[PDB]
Amino acid sequence: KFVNEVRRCEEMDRKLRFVEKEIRKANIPIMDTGENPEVPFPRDMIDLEANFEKIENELKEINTNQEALKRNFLELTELKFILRKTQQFFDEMADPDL
């Protein structure tokens, strides 16, 4: 009967594993309080799913955007260096304006 519930719980566990893996990849540490709260019998699963969906989607979008923007930044800095050195090369005697 409850295989739907157990499947969704497994998906939540996968989300938490992914976020924890990103945590380890970063230098940030993982706290340890010692509390052992009980799972909320009422449909707090919806709230937990929303929270973890945010914490995963935001991190994935952040990673993708970081990768793309780093690529663009590197390409643009290469272009900047190329422009500067081409200007340097075109400096023997630039009597004409164009």
């Binding site: 739907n4 009422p42 449909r43 919806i46 663009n72 643009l76």
Partner: protein, 430 residues
């Protein structure tokens, strides 16, 4: 506790000869009561009722009014309730007795509701409610107003109090099942009282009774339209999310179906759908649908509610809604502001009116100081950029890049997050 009180009253039989000896009751009334008590068989009781239809009610009223002892009143109320339960059509005998008396049966017990015994008061109220529901007499006038006020006082009393409130709620549901009593309660302040009772976070039985009352009241389109002032939908959705009782869930879903189907006007239907969407009932409905129940009623209600919510969401996502919201400055995280299909298939329309929409967005991002408005504008700009790369040049020409970058470091973190997302989207590609 009502069932226990009824069982105790039935078990404790008090002789009615004391009243006759003291002259506080009529001899004919005492004889009729004794005959009814001796005749417990269905046939004997029916024959006695047919023979002395007016006599039975007259004797009961006389004994209850004259005798200050609670035992006799409890016994009479228990007998009347048992007769009604065995045959709800027995109310015709009391109706005929009242007709013979040439007076409404309500007054004969209206002061009785003030009797000391809470069990006796509840039994009398239940008898009156059942008689009203089953008969042709639509209770009204000062007596009806006083009865409604007594029910309201019992509700405000809110566990013995919880059980009394549950009995009052059963009587209220029986009364509201009729069309006229529905308008009567709506005109009265009963809706606010029920909303307050729900806000008080009563027990499971009280919550179920209140939900049933709301569902019944929602049947009539006029009541549904009028009740919108109370904004029940938020508290109802909160209760649905918090609680897990199958009865409560079914009652709430049926109430939502009634509200979305009996609405007089499409405007009211859209208002209710928007209220539900903002309360985030769509996700709860989806989770419930994923969950499996037994009764087909729950499944049908869930399917209908989901279909109506989806249709309303699409209607809101219509680009005309976005244009009107932009014109009116209604940047409050409406469903259109995040509808993926809307942004994907209508981003080009943002250039309409010679980039008037983009100009309005830029002006809002520049002037607006409300954090919510600023965040909504930033998210809309980011969505436009993401869904239409060609608009990056237009945004840069309008200067939206500079405004978004400036707002990135805005004081409000809520605005800052949206600004960062929009900036990343804008700078994603050269």
């Amino acid at each position: 506790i009502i069932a226990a009180k009824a069982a105790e009253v039935r078990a404790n039989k008090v002789n009615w000869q004391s009243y006759l000896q003291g002259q506080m009751i009529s001899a004919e009334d005492c004889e009729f009561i004794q005959r009814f008590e001796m005749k417990r068989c269905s046939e004997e009781k029916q024959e006695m009722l047919q023979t002395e239809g007016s006599q039975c009610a007259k004797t009961f009223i006389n004994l209850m009014t004259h005798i200050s002892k609670e035992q006799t009143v409890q016994y009479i109320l228990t007998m009347v309730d048992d007769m009604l339960q065995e045959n709800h059509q027995r109310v015709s005998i009391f109706f005929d007795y009242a007709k013979r008396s040439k007076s409404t049966a309500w007054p004969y017990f209206l002061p009785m509701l003030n009797r000391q015994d809470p069990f006796t008061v509840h039994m009398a109220a239940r008898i009156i409610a059942k008689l009203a529901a089953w008969g042709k007499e639509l209770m009204e006038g000062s007596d009806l107003n006083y009865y409604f006020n007594w029910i309201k006082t019992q509700l405000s009393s809110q566990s013995d109090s919880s059980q009394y409130v549950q009995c009052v709620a059963g009587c209220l549901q029986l009364m509201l099942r009729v069309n006229e009593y529905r308008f009567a309660w709506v005109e009265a302040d009963g809706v606010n009282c029920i909303m307050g009772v729900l806000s008080n976070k009563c027990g499971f039985q009280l919550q179920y009774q209140m939900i049933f009352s709301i569902w019944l009241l929602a049947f009539s389109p006029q009541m549904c339209e009028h009740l919108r002032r109370y904004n029940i939908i938020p508290v109802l959705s909160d209760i649905l999310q918090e609680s897990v009782k199958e009865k409560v869930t079914r009652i709430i879903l049926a109430a939502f179906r009634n509200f979305l189907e009996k609405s007089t006007e499409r405007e009211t239907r859209q208002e209710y759908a928007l209220a539900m969407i903002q309360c985030k009932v769509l996700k709860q409905l989806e989770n419930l649908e994923q969950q499996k129940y037994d009764d087909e009623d729950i499944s049908e209600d869930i399917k209908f509610l989901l279909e109506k919510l989806g249709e309303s969401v699409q209607d809101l996502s219509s680009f005309d809604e976005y244009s009107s919201e932009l014109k009116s400055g209604r940047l409050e995280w409406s469903p259109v502001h995040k509808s993926e299909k809307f942004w994907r298939e209508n981003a080009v329309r943002l250039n309409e009116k010679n980039y008037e929409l983009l100009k309005i967005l830029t002006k809002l991002l520049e002037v607006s100081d409300d954090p919510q408005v600023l965040a909504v504008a930033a998210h809309d700009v980011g969505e436009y950029v993401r869904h239409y790369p060609r608009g990056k040049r237009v945004f840069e020409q309008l200067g939206g890049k500079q405004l978004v970058m400036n707002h990135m470091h805005h004081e409000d973190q809520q605005v800052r997050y949206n600004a960062l997302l929009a900036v990343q989207k804008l700078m994603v590609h050269n």
